[PDB]
Design a protein around this ligand. Structure first.
Ligand SMILES: COC(=O)c1c[nH]c2ncccc12
Ligand code: NA
Length: 315
């Protein structure tokens, strides 16, 4: 499940070789091209690293903290130089400058799945199969090689590109950057598992809930809680709640589900196994990797890049 084919081995080797040419990252070496997002307490820009000529994505986190603090964060973000996977966004480096931490990463031309969703309206089942594989393999990589979980799976944290690659970004790597960002805002809690919202027992099972929740949103074209009325489905397939009320609904109500007679039973089953409220009964990475929907999605050779380019008008 963590074994790479020839094309993925080659792409990973070409990225590291290219990264080795980049030295110490410095503020003045960057030229802004455009803006990309802001979903996790910062701002993302498409930038040009002037000396190397490489196009990167630069996350700027505005924090006003004593020299001692920032230096620890930066040492802790060095963990990311070890995160080498076709399912994790490439990391170039991190530094502090004029009151802000910069995280420099690989630029994904397809953007994030929240953006792809907005354009598309809804994402087809076969495309969601490819997304599911990448999320499971990404979470398996994080857990296997670095003994860490994502903690923030959601559509905006899944990045796509014109080469048909799907990658995860924005996973807790620096304990200090987390602690120094307390009282929030570090991102919405609307994708959190019932167990995390109860302050109870939390593992990679919480990430599986988030994935399951994100898949239903992308398949239907709407954030799924509260479930849609019989009339809202007739609009969609022919065939407002305040955050505190919403978080209560997740803990207290039955989990969302895909509408029937629209999606395959294998896909409906797969999301249901991710969305079981009790994390013990809920499926795990090993179980998900051999699920009928995953095996069928793997054997399906889906032109993800072709679908992507047509949908967002890339080219
Ligand atoms: C937090 O990381 C990001 O948002 C991104 C990292 N690379 C990207 N490429 C395009 C859009 C967003 C990003
Ligand atoms: Na993000």
């Amino acid at each position: 499940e963590l074994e790479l084919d020839e094309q993925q081995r080659k792409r990973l080797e070409a990225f590291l070789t290219q990264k080795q040419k980049v030295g110490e990252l410095k503020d003045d070496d960057f030229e802004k091209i455009s803006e990309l997002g802001a979903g996790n307490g910062g701002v993302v820009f498409k930038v040009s690293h002037k000396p190397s000529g490489l196009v990167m994505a630069r996350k700027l986190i505005h924090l006003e903290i004593k020299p001692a603090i920032r230096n620890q964060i930066i040492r802790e973000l060095q963990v990311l130089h070890e995160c080498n996977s076709p399912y994790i966004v490439g990391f170039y480096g991190a530094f502090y400058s004029d009151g802000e931490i910069s995280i420099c990463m690989e630029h994904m031309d397809g953007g994030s799945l929240d953006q792809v969703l907005k354009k598309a309206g809804r994402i087809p089942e076969q495309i969601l199969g490819k997304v599911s594989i990448a999320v499971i393999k990404g979470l398996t990589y994080l857990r296997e090689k670095h003994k860490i979980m994502h903690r923030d799976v959601k559509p905006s944290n899944i990045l796509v590109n014109s080469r048909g690659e799907i990658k995860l970004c924005d996973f807790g790597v620096s304990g200090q950057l987390i602690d120094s960002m307390a009282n929030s805002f570090v991102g919405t809690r609307s994708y959190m598992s019932p167990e995390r919202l109860q302050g109870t027992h939390y593992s990679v099972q919480s990430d599986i809930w988030s994935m399951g929740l994100s898949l239903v949103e992308m398949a239907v074209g709407r954030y799924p809680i509260p479930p849609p009325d019989a009339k809202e489905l007739e609009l969609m397939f022919g065939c407002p709640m305040a955050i505190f009320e919403l978080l209560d609904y997740i803990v207290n109500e039955p989990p969302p589900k895909l509408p029937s007679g629209v999606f395959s039973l294998e896909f409906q089953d797969f999301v249901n196994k991710c969305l079981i409220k009790n994390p013990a009964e809920r499926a795990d990475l090993k179980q998900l990797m051999v699920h009928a929907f995953i095996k069928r999605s793997d054997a399906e050779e889906v032109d993800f890049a072709g679908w992507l380019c047509s949908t967002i008008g890339l080219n």
